[PDB]
Amino acid sequence: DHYELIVDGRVYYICIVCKRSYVCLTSLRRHFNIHSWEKKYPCRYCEKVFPLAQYRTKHEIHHTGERRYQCLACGKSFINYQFMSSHIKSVHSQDPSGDSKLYRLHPCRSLQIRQY
DNA sequence: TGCTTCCTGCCAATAACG
DNA sequence: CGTTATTGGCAGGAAGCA
Ligand SMILES: [Cl-]
Ligand SMILES: [Zn+2]
Ligand SMILES: [Zn+2]
Ligand SMILES: [Zn+2]
């Protein structure tokens, strides 16, 4: 499934197939589905299948049109981080990865996923 | 060259377990 | 039914793309 590389006490897990390296073994296993397709994640709204559960989730939010990311400076909402970020940078000349929280991520309500 | 999707360290929520 | 194992959400940078 994988092998290990250790440099300066640091442990990395190497994918047998593509030789990508991971700090986290769980990352390796998650990534490896791409090669093996042991598990499948079918979009419940269309024919598409995904090698990662989170890819399907992001895809399914596109079908529902829920806009979970809201700019706190003007109230506009966006379907993902990327649209929200580029809005805030270009319209508000600010960075949401900065020290201030410039946005809110709402709970997913248009489908059923894990709640924080 | 701006959408669009992908990626992975981290770890909370969920599941399996015994 | 607590304890241990797994799943997958998330940020935000990278990669892909027409
Ligand atoms: Cl919404
Ligand atoms: Zn690989
Ligand atoms: Zn779909
Ligand atoms: Zn705004």
d(CA A21, CA A40): 23
Relative to the alpha carbon of A61, which ligand is closest?
A: 3
Experimental method: X-ray
Relative to the alpha carbon of A103, which ligand is closest?
A: 4
Smallest Cα–Cα separation from A110: which of A77, A85, A75, A87?
A77
- The CATH architecture to which A69-105 belongs is 2-Layer Sandwich (3.30)
DSSP string spanning A3-55? EEEEETTEEEEEETTT--EES-HHHHHHHHHHHH--S-EE-TTSS-EESSHHH
d(CA A45, CA A47): 7
Measured between alpha carbons, how far is residue A104 from residues A12, A48, A70, A74 in Å? 35, 30, 5, 12
| Nucleotide closest to residue A61 (CA–C1') | C9
Resolution in Å, one decimal, please: 2.3
Instruction: Measure A115 CA to C3 C1' (Å).
Output: 22
